[PDB]
Paper text:
The hormone binding globulins, corticosteroid binding globulin (CBG) and thyroxine binding globulin (TBG), are examples of naturally occurring site-specific carriers. Upon cleavage of their reactive centre loops, both hormone binding globulins undergo the canonical serpin conformational change that involves the incorporation of the cleaved reactive centre loop into the central β-sheet A as a new β-strand.
This forms a direct covalent bond between the s2A/hD loop at the top of helix D and β-sheet B, which along with helices A and H make up the steroid binding pocket. We predicted that by covalently linking the s2A/hD loop to the binding pocket, any effect caused by the movement of the loop as a result of the S-to-R conformational change would be amplified. The disulphide mutations were made on the T349R background to allow cleavage by thrombin. However, in the absence of TCEP, cleavage of the reactive centre loop resulted in a 6.5-fold decrease in binding affinity for cortisol, as shown in Table 2. We went on to obtain the crystal structure of reactive centre loop-cleaved CBG-S100C-V236C-T349R, which revealed that the binding pocket was indeed perturbed by the presence of the disulphide bridge. Cleavage after Arg349 was supported by clear density for this residue, located at the bottom of sheet A after insertion of the RCL, and for Pro352, located more than 60Å away at the other end of the molecule, though density for Ser350 and Lys351 could not be interpreted unambiguously. The X-ray data also showed that the disulphide linkage has an occupancy of only about half, which suggests either that the disulphide bond is broken by radiation damage during data collection or, more likely, that even under non-reducing conditons, only about half of a given population of the CBG-S100C-V236C-T349R molecules have the desired disulphide bond at a given time. This could explain the relatively small effect of these mutations. (B) When the disulphide bridge is formed, there is an obvious distortion of the steroid binding pocket, as shown here by superimposing the R-state structures of CBG (pale blue, transparent) and CBG-S100C-V236C-T349R (coloured as in A).
Author numbering: 15 to 349, 352 to 383
Amino acid sequence: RGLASANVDFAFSLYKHLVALSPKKNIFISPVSISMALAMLSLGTCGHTRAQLLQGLGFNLTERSETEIHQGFQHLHQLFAKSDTCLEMTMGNALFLDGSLELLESFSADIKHYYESEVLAMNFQDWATASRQINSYVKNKTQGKIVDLFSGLDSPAILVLVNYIFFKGTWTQPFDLASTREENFYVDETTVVKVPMMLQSSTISYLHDSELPCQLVQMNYCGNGTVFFILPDKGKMNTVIAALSRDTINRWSAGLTSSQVDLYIPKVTISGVYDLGDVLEEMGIADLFTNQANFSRITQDAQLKSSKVVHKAVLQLNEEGVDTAGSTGVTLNLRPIILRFNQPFIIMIFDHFTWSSLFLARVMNPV
């Protein structure tokens, strides 16, 4: 139990669902961004809408109160803000509000207290300008990495909630630039591509999993960052992914041991863009999109529903470290061992202190 375990449960569930929907595509998401955005959103919900949303995010409202959930995300946000200076990290929230709406004071107080959310004015009557405005805001917070989060063709919103996350970290064990070389990467049975393959021969935290058919290594970045690189055995990608759980992570952490490893990992430049409505509904999070949605804690002068939940994430991974960003938007409307990663593999980016799932990747093609 606890926030950390719940957020991991949600992260892996979302990941599994997205992988199932796009069997041949790279997957890249920021679970913590999505969880934080929807948790903040839940502050405005009531009744069944609220109960369903919080359950979907992995929380049990018997056993834990809503206040405790929001306190959890507050401390999480606060710790990301106070990252070690060797890690450049940004993580925050914003609410864009049309002039026609007035937030109930309790809701405005809550989003400011728990999520430190900015509250910015927009003119939804001009969706072109408003969507450009929100996009610019997110682009700036992610230092240019997340662009065009919204389009002028999206259904106009009178309220938009945004979470952004960005960081640039350096490996505690970087790869030698001079040792990078082109190698074959086997996407599938009929597809082989040329990729820049990084190499280092080091004392690496390694595990050949005895319960799942996979090998993995843990690579740290400064500022308490940990990255799991997981290589499923041939033909076992789906088996490993389907099995991912909080218990799996605990087992890996306990089983990882220092070993001499010739570690080949390719440079990774990937991205993910998602309209999360359909997959969230598969996961039981649906009522908030319907004409029966209850957002009465935002306002009682109007009945709102969510129209769209969008998510974008980008990863740049190279010899020196990891540069990554993500953003989630919610719109509302009136109702030695040789280990070579030359086949599809999994990347998990965690904050070690909180065990927050910052990013998850399924890499089908690292180029």
